[PDB]
Structure formats: structure tokens, C-alpha cells
Amino acid sequence: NGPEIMSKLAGESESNLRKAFEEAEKNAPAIIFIDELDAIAPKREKTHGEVERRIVSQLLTLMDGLKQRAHVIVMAATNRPNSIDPALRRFGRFDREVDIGIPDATGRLEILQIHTKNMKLADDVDLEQVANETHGHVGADLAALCSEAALQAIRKKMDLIDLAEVMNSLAVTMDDFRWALSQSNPSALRETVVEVPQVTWEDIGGLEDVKRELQELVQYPVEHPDKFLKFGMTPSKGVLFYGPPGCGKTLLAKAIANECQANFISIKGPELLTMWFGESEANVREIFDKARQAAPCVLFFDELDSIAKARGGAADRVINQILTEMDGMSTKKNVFIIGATNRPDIIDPAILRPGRLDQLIYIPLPDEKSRVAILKANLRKSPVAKDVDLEFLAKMTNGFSGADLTEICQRACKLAIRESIESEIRRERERDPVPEIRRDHFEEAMRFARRSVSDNDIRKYEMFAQTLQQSRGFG
Amino acid sequence: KQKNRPNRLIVDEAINEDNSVVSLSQPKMDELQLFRGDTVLLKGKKRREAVCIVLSDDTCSDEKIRMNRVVRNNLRVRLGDVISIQPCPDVKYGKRIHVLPIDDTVEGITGNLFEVYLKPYFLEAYRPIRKGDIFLVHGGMRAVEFKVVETDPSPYCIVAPDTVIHCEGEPIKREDEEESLNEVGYDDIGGCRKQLAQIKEMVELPLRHPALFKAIGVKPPRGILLYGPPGTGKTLIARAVANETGAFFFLINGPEIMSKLAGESESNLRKAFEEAEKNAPAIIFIDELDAIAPKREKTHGEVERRIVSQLLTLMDGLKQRAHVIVMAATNRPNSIDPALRRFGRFDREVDIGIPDATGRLEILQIHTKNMKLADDVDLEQVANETHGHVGADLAALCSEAALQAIRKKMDLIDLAEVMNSLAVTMDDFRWALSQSNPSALRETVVEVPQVTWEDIGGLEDVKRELQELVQYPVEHPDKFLKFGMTPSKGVLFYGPPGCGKTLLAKAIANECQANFISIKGPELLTMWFGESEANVREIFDKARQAAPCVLFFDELDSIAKARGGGAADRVINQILTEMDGMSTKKNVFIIGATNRPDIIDPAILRPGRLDQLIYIPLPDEKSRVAILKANLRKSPVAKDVDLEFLAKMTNGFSGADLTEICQRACKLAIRESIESEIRRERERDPVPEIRRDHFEEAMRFARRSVSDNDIRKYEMFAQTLQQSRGFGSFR
Numbered sequence A: 001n002g003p004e005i006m007s008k009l010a011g012e013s014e015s016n017l018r019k020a021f022e023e024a025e026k027n028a029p030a031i032i033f034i035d036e037l038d039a040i041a042p043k044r045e046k047t048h049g050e051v052e053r054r055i056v057s058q059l060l061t062l063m064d065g066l067k068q069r070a071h072v073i074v075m076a077a078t079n080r081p082n083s084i085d086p087a088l089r090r091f092g093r094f095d096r097e098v099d100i101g102i103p104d105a106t107g108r109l110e111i112l113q114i115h116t117k118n119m120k121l122a123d124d125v126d127l128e129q130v131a132n133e134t135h136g137h138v139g140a141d142l143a144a145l146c147s148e149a150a151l152q153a154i155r156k157k158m159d160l161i162d163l164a165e166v167m168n169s170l171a172v173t174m175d176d177f178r179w180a181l182s183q184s185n186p187s188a189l190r191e192t193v194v195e196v197p198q199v200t201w202e203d204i205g206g207l208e209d210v211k212r213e214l215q216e217l218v219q220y221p222v223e224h225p226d227k228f229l230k231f232g233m234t235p236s237k238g239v240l241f242y243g244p245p246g247c248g249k250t251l252l253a254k255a256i257a258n259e260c261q262a263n264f265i266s267i268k269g270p271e272l273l274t275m276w277f278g279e280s281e282a283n284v285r286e287i288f289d290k291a292r293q294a295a296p297c298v299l300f301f302d303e304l305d306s307i308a309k310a311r312g313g314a315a316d317r318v319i320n321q322i323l324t325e326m327d328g329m330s331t332k333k334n335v336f337i338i339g340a341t342n343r344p345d346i347i348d349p350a351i352l353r354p355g356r357l358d359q360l361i362y363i364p365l366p367d368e369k370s371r372v373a374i375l376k377a378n379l380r381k382s383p384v385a386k387d388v389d390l391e392f393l394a395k396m397t398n399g400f401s402g403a404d405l406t407e408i409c410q411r412a413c414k415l416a417i418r419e420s421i422e423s424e425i426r427r428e429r430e431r432d433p434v435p436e437i438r439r440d441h442f443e444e445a446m447r448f449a450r451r452s453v454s455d456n457d458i459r460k461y462e463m464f465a466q467t468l469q470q471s472r473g474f475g
Numbered sequence B: 001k002q003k004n005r006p007n008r009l010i011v012d013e014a015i016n017e018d019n020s021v022v023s024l025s026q027p028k029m030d031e032l033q034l035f036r037g038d039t040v041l042l043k044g045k046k047r048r049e050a051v052c053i054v055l056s057d058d059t060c061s062d063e064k065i066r067m068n069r070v071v072r073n074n075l076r077v078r079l080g081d082v083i084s085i086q087p088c089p090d091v092k093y094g095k096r097i098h099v100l101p102i103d104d105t106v107e108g109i110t111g112n113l114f115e116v117y118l119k120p121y122f123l124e125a126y127r128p129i130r131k132g133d134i135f136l137v138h139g140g141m142r143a144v145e146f147k148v149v150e151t152d153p154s155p156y157c158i159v160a161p162d163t164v165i166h167c168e169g170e171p172i173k174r175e176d177e178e179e180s181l182n183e184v185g186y187d188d189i190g191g192c193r194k195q196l197a198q199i200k201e202m203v204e205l206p207l208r209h210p211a212l213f214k215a216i217g218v219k220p221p222r223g224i225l226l227y228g229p230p231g232t233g234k235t236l237i238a239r240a241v242a243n244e245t246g247a248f249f250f251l252i253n254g255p256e257i258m259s260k261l262a263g264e265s266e267s268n269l270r271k272a273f274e275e276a277e278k279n280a281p282a283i284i285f286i287d288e289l290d291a292i293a294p295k296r297e298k299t300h301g302e303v304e305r306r307i308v309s310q311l312l313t314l315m316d317g318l319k320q321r322a323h324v325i326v327m328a329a330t331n332r333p334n335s336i337d338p339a340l341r342r343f344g345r346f347d348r349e350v351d352i353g354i355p356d357a358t359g360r361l362e363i364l365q366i367h368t369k370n371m372k373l374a375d376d377v378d379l380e381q382v383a384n385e386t387h388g389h390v391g392a393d394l395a396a397l398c399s400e401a402a403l404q405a406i407r408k409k410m411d412l413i414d415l416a417e418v419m420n421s422l423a424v425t426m427d428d429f430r431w432a433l434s435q436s437n438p439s440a441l442r443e444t445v446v447e448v449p450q451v452t453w454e455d456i457g458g459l460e461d462v463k464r465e466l467q468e469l470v471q472y473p474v475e476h477p478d479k480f481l482k483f484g485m486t487p488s489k490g491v492l493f494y495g496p497p498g499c500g501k502t503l504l505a506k507a508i509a510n511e512c513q514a515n516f517i518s519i520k521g522p523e524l525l526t527m528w529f530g531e532s533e534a535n536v537r538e539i540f541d542k543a544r545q546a547a548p549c550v551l552f553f554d555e556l557d558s559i560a561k562a563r564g565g566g567a568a569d570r571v572i573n574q575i576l577t578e579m580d581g582m583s584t585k586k587n588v589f590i591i592g593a594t595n596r597p598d599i600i601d602p603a604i605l606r607p608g609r610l611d612q613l614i615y616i617p618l619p620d621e622k623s624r625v626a627i628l629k630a631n632l633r634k635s636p637v638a639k640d641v642d643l644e645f646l647a648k649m650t651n652g653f654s655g656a657d658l659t660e661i662c663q664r665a666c667k668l669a670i671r672e673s674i675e676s677e678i679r680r681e682r683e684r685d686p687v688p689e690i691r692r693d694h695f696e697e698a699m700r701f702a703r704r705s706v707s708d709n710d711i712r713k714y715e716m717f718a719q720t721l722q723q724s725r726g727f728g729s730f731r
């Protein structure tokens, strides 16, 4: 370990660092691991002192001391790539760079069976929906969650005479898992997830032409590499998305990466504003290089007009590095940039030039088949029964926002929660839950939904569409 | 708690003069399985022991055990306390005994004390002794105390006639601090129970249960941070878990490590943890962890990086060996080096915080256990106005009150006259509160306020959705395991100048029995202008630690007026980034207050982040009665006017304006009482009953603080809030 070398006195830092390297002279098949090397070799100008430079210099000297003699392998534990100084991680000398990241729902699931294959669960928990949630959780925290579950298994037993009545048969419940999760905290929070999410593409209906160029864009650069090379031109680097602020949070680019089995990294809107306001224009290189290293991922940028709204009181700091690293990027690596912006008038003029971002795909307001698909997605992954209908909404929902329709469904579902509370009151003054909503349970929810889009914004969307509408010739 | 042992009895006075003879009742000796001359083990405080012989006593109570003050001083107990008596069938006779007399009991007498005191006391008596105990042997019309130093049967022994007694001349010093508990009382520390129970569980279940570690898989605690304000009793917390399980405490000061020279600074830690490692029950307390381990940019020096690295190595060297854990005090966890806060290495992190009102009440009770009161104080409203204080400040308060009680006495003959009984009164505590410098001030705290929903009425359907949006998700989550999806993360209040919104928000957390935090608007402006927007993340972290809790925000139009005349600020996007990482679970409810909802950054109105918007109108004419019923306290009157005369004609006035009317009537009433009593002093029972005229000049000497052109903007928001509803379905 690195702090073993750091803990010794001056002059003894040479000891217990080279000593493993002539110990590796004995063993021809051998590896060398240094734990927590960020404390060993940080930025040289960041350190105040000289012994740190001595340790860094002797480690760099003993890196190539075994120049393919014993064929040993050096691996290390780095918390961040920018913690390591760039002189040590130069190419040819300690430069093979892979990553770990955070596990997905299946990874958290496998962590759960690994940590529960030794202990005895009470074989009633699902252990899968638990791993589907706990977003931003290290598997060490999953081990701590299992330890807290066993602690609750001790705790629900009263103060006994210390005999194996509960010790021989450890009883754990799903409510125990949830309450141990409640008395816990994530440490992998506010980090960019590199795993692919799934919505399985059925939840979005309509916009079939938009689906046609979305299957044109990212489905076959690696699925049809030679067929795309029949003409020889490069794939389209960037696509810009514009339309009304409705049904426009996420999951479309996640779906279109999910047919390609590609990773997903989303860039948040206020994350860009925080990096702009905090004068931190160096971490954009880190997240862009992480996105390039997570290939074949497709990027997603949200609310670029918010930076333009901040400039409104066209180019600024965060636009400059985005343009620089987007132009300074190969046409390979299967990397696509998707920009979400509901205000196309205030955007940067160098974005819309072709070669960088060219496909100005317009997303219209959700129509009748789109809202039928939205109610079907609300039926998806949610408990529901029959007598529900959608033909009332043929003129009730003429044109609605998708977020408006989801909060309609959520408010009606919480009205069903309120009538379940009334069923609890029924059980209270007795001394049926009826989870399915009423036939006209949406009737008061009709007064809980305003069309937040104004008609002049639809007019300016039509004007920007007809500005980019092109010529028609015949005869 | 445990019914496995009937050992818990009551300490009572004894009849027999023998120090090695204790008394018990006849029916309770057969339950404890004791013989005629059985030797038992008595356990008192500071895990000390004393071995005596139980004899049957007819007048002894069944629930009580009789002992004299020699046994009582050895067990470090008093009258009315509880001890445990254990039968010991493995007691053997003594081989060698080394004792040393105490210095103050041998002054004036010289010579061989073996043949005068030690020989008739230990001949044909079979008295069992304990190493470290104090026994008194009379002789020569004086009282000479004796203390056991070294025995060849090192745990305990019975003084055989063949036992050689080593009694060479060396006078030992009597320590007055050894008698009082140091500090073994579970109830000695107070005001922390909601987390004291948690930390007592996480240090209790690793102890006493070594075989439970194979069932637990991995032990959850290895190193526990104790962060909070200074003076809250972290040393007393560390001494509280000390000696309650029979584990070695071994307090280690951070300055005591930093004070020594290099090499010696490298020493006294691995020596310290190996001295912990030789014993199986072992705790280590560290004070001033940040003095040992500050931030990396704070480290300008060779030695400190070496000692942080050595602490890191010496912590992760132990891996499930001999169940040893460590606790450390901390100002605030941002100052600690973040490489320490890992998993398997400082994973369990607990907060203490300031004491509550009942907490400061019981802490005042604890610190006034040992001193005599005059029995005239209220002693609860003393603790009620101690806002922004700490337990060290409370100790300073009681010390200054006793100092003022000393100042009641003049310069007397300096003998024991008022030392027999003190006469500290309530105005002494008022004077101590007058010269009271707080420590927890300039720091926002968390507590559960006392409102209980009955101060303000109205909003009868806003309150119902307020319980089923906040309270009932906490109450029953099985309906959320039903058809129910995720609930709303938080709401925002907009309406009048929000003088009622804080009392409208605090009442839920009292009803929910949840915590509350109010981050005020000037603090948010200080976070913007002071370039301290990173600390909002730690504020949200302490909010998540205080789950369940209510996040109160206010005057978000104030931060938007500085840019409206860009849109977002350095703190608005940071707040959005913090609340976007908030889970749908954990019941972390947020609430915002805004006087001007038009000047709002529009990155909050979409659902998913924050969906529900709560409009409130002015308190109407029936709401005047609801506000005036809350004036039963803080301006008490019984019957002088009906409290509906002002509400019958006045069109619109704020409840802030109505309480301004009440406080100005209070001012007029107190003033006319003052010219009622100065004339009686001039001529030579307050009668604080007020009349209608104070209400008359209060209701005429007033001004409606709200503006009418903002109200029509609120019905502009309300006519926006009539929406695109349908008339009805056709089934």
C-alpha cells in the first residue's frame, strides 16, 4: 500500500518500494499493485514539500527498471484520472487506461446474490426491485445494507439469553430492507451514470418519420460499417432537437441507444450552468473524455437555451469548449451529440452549420395517437384494471403537453390514494380498499391541467419551421 | 431488560459491623443459590468489583441488599442505587498480599502497623479482599484506612493464615476523583436520546456478542465520526460508552500526538493501538481529528502528512481482529481529509447537534442534581429561552447562577455556613442569561417546534391535501406499494407577505414527529454574495442525515430581483442539482415561500422536480377569530371585549398587521399600567387586565401592509389557474 511507504521516515521511502521490485525478480509470473496511488503521485505543483517529489521520481525510475525482464504487471487504484499528474501517465509508461464506473441494476443484483449466498435470507424478499432502485449506490453500501438488514434481524428479536433462536435462522423482510435503506445514505450520488437504461421503445407512439431518421442516424454506423462506406461519406456528427416543452425530458435517446446496445451519458442543464457560473471549464474535458471512453455511447445535452437565456440578460465559455472538443473529435468512436432545446431562436449560430450539427429535426406537439401511447405507457409498469377508457379524450385532450398528461395521471392516482385514505377512515369508524380509480376519476383532474404552452410560441415554432422549410420544384 | 439474572437489588444500610460481611434475606438466598458462608461478587460502577460474604438477615428486604459505607465506597455507589450480586464458586485462598497505607490515616502514628492493625484483622477470619479496594481497620482509638495493591491471586483472593502480607513503608495518595463516576451514567448525558439510542445500539451490539459477528457477515462499525458544535459533550459521550460494557477507554488527544517530537510523534500511536490490541474489549477516543488530519491544501508541513498516513495505515491494518473500534470528535466533516471517509474506514457517521428544549431541561436537571436549589424556580422557562446555547454554555449558566448566589452572601468568615444549603433563585438564572455569550448562534439548527396545529385555522382543504401529500406518505406506504406512484417532492407557497407561512410549515413536522430546517433568505443571499454556494450541498447532506425533515425556503423572489431588473444564479442551479439528486423515498419534504411568484426562475415549475403550486389568499373575516384565538397566550386576557368587533367592519388586514395591532395594544396597556403604578409610588398588585380603548387606538393606529395592485396580480395567477377542463364524459 502507498501509505505504508508514505508512513515511513525520510530515506526509508526508498525502503518498502524498491524491495517489492527485487522481490519480483524472484517470481517471474508476478503482479505489482499500489493501493491509493493518488496520495503517492498527485500533481507536483500541488504538493508543498520535497519528499513527495523524491517518491514520485523513484517510482518513475523503478517503473522502467524492469524493462521486460521479469515481465511484471503494474496496476493501481486511482480515484480520479486528474488526480494523477500527466507526467507519470504518459504514453508508453504506465498508460493502459480502463475504468470501472458504477454497476447497473443487474450488477447490483449480482452483488446482492454474492453478499447473500453466505448468509441465510428468509426467502420472501424479491431482491430484484431493490437492486433496480438504489440509484447511485456502491456495492460496498449494498454490503452495508445487508449488514443493516442482519442488524435489524437481531433488533426485532428482544434481549434474549444469547442463544441461536434467531441466529440459526436469520429472518429478513422487504420492509426491513427498505427501512435499512432509509437509515442509509448514498456516496456515488451526483455522478454521471455510464450504464444504459431501458424503456423498450413501445412507450413512444407517433412521429414515425422522426423514428425513420432516428433509425437512420445511430442504428447502423457499426451495424453496417461497410454498407455505409459504399458512398464514403462520414456519418452525421450532431443532431439538434427542438419543439414545444412537452414529453421532452429523457428516454428517447436512451431507447435509440438501447436498440444499438450502446451506453448512455446525459449532461444536465443546470450542471452546465453550475460549471459556467463556478468558472470551472476544465471538467468538461473530463466528462467529454469519459463519454468518449464509454464508447459506443450517445451524448444528450439538455436546455442549451438556458445558457442563451442567461446571455439574454451568443457565445460564452461553455460554448467554446463544447465547440472545440466537438470539432476536435474523430468521426469514429460511434459518438453522437444530441441537443435538447425548446427555444431555437436564441441558439448559437455556429452550432447550426452542417458538419458539426446539421439535422434540424423538428418534434411536433403530441397528437391523439401520441397521447394514447402516453396513457399506454402510464398503463405500462403500473397496476391497472379495466373499465378505463380513452375515447373521452379524443376532444378533451386535443393538444396537451406530455408532462401535463403525466401529472394528470399522477394527480388522478393520488386522488385514488386519497380515496384509499378514505377507505382507511372507513376501517377506522368500523371499529374494501378499492385500488382501481373511478369511471370519471379524471373529471376533477380536468381542472388540474393548464395548457402551459402559449399560442405565439407555437406560431414562432411554425415560423422557424417554415424558415427552414425548403423548395418544391416540379413540371 | 434481561430477565436472565435477578442480581439487580437496592443498596441499603447494614447492621453488622464487619466490612467483609453483607446481609441478605432468607427467601432470596435460595433463589440466588447461596450457601451459609458463600462468597459473592458485587458489581457497582466503573466495572469495579468487591468480594464479600452473604449472611442471612431477617430484617433485610427481599428487593434490597444491606451494606455499610466501606463496601459502598468500594463499589462507587450511593444509597438507593442499583448493583448486581453474583455468586462466585471459583474463589481460592491467597498466596501473597501487598498492601500500602493511605497517607492521611497514618500521620502521627509510627511503628510496625502489621502487628497492631493487620494481624488481628486477618487471623482466622476468612475475609475475601479485592485488589484496589479500600477497607477500614480500627485500632488505637483512630480510623486507619488500608488499600490492596498487589496480590499473587491477581483477580481476587481470600486471606489464608499461610498468606504472607507485604506491608513495607510507602504512603499512597488518596484520590478524590476516584469516588465519583467518571462517567458511567447512561442518564449522566442527556439531550441526545434520538441519536444516543442509535449510537448506543451501534456500540452495544458489537460488544457482548462475539459469536454474532459470524451471523452479521461484516461488522458495520469500525470508526465512528462524532461531528457537531463544540461543547455539546463529545468527551462526555465517549466517557459514557466507556465503562458501560467493560471496555478499555484510552482517551487520546490530537494535540497530545502533535506536541511530541518527530519519531516520538511517529510513536505513541502504534504503541497506543497495540496497547489497545492486547485487550479484547477496546475502544479508542480521539479528540481534534481535524488538528491531526486537516485538508490537503491546509497541510503545509512534512510531519502532518506523515502522521495522517500513519493513522491511515494503523486503521486499515486491523481487519475483523479483536473487535476494536475507534471514535473521533469533529468540528464539521468538510474540514476532515476526504480520503479518511471511506467504506471499511470511517463509514458510520453520526450527528449530535444542539440539545432541544426538553433536552436542555434534563441537562439542567442533571447539572443541578449535585447542588441544592431553593425550590422556587420554574426551571423550565429557564431552559425555554436558552436558544443558540450548548451544554458547556448551560454549565456556565449554572456556574454563574451559583456565583451570583455566592454574591448574595457578603464577605463572611469563610467557614461552612451557606455550604450546607444554597439559595439560588430564578433571577440569578435571569442574570446569568443576561451575561450569556452563545456558541450555537450564527449557525442554523434543527429541532421539532411546538405548534400542534391550533395556532392558525383556515385552509380546510389545503390542509387535507397537506396531510395526504406529506403526512400520509410517512404514515402508510402500503398504499404507495399499491396503484400509487411516487408522490410530490415538494410544494411552494405563494400569496401574501409570508408572515404566516413559517407557522404554516412548522406544524407538519410537529404533527409528523419529524425534524425541521428553515434556511432563511438573507442566509441564501449571504451564500450567493459570499461565494459559499458549495456549503448548500453540506446543508442538504445534514438535511438527509436528519431524515425525515422539512426543507423550508423563503423569499426566492428576492434572489430573482437582482437579475430580473440574467435568469439563474450561482445558488439556484446548485439548489436544483442538490434536489435532483434527492431520492423519491426518505420523505425529505421541501417547501418554498415566495411573496412575488411572478419573478421566479422558470426551472422549477415542471413536474418531477416540483409540481404542486399552493396559492393562499389573505386571511378573511372568519380568519380574524382564528388569529385572535392564538392571542390567548403571549397577551392573556379573560373577558373585557368580544373578539369579533374588529372583524365585523374591517375589510382586509394581514395577520402580521393583526399581531402588530395586538402588540401595540400590549404596549399601550403596559404603558398605562406604568402611569398607574408611578402615581402609587408617588402616593407612598399589577392588575394587568386591559380594556377596549387600547384595542380602539390599536385598531386605529395601524396600517394594512399589503398592497392592492399585488392582489390583482394574484387573481391574474388565479385566472391563469382556471384551466382547460372538459364538461364531462359521455358514458
Ligand SMILES: Nc1ncnc2c1ncn2[C@@H]1O[C@H](COP(=O)(O)OP(=O)(O)O)[C@@H](O)[C@H]1O
Binding pocket: A241, A242, A243, A244, A245, A246, A247, A248, A249, A250, A251, A252, A253, A340, A341, A342, A343, A363, A403, B606
Ligand atoms: N422523448 C424525448 N426525449 C428527449 N427529448 C425530447 C423528447 N421529446 C422532445 N424532446 C426535446 O425536448 C425539448 C423539450 O423538453 P421538455 O418537454 O421541456 O422537458 P421536460 O419533459 O423535462 O419538460 C424539445 O425541444 C424537444 O426537442
Ligand SMILES: Nc1ncnc2c1ncn2[C@@H]1O[C@H](COP(=O)(O)OP(=O)(O)O)[C@@H](O)[C@H]1O
Binding pocket: B188, B189, B190, B191, B230, B231, B232, B233, B234, B235, B236, B237, B287, B329, B355, B363, B366, B390, B391, B392, B395
Ligand atoms: N450535554 C451535556 N450534558 C452534560 N454535560 C456536558 C454536556 N455538554 C458538555 N458537557 C460538559 O462539558 C465538558 C466538556 O465536554 P466536551 O465539549 O465534549 O469536551 P471537549 O471540549 O474536549 O470536546 C464535559 O466534561 C461535560 O461534563
Ligand SMILES: Nc1ncnc2c1ncn2[C@@H]1O[C@H](COP(=O)(O)OP(=O)(O)O)[C@@H](O)[C@H]1O
Binding pocket: B456, B497, B498, B499, B500, B501, B502, B503, B554, B619, B627, B654, B655, B656, B657, B659
Ligand atoms: N396566519 C398568519 N398570517 C400572517 N402573519 C402571521 C400569521 N400567524 C402569525 N403571524 C405573525 O407573523 C410573524 C412571523 O413572521 P415570519 O413568518 O417570520 O415572516 P417571514 O417568513 O416573511 O420572515 C409572527 O410574529 C406572527 O405574529
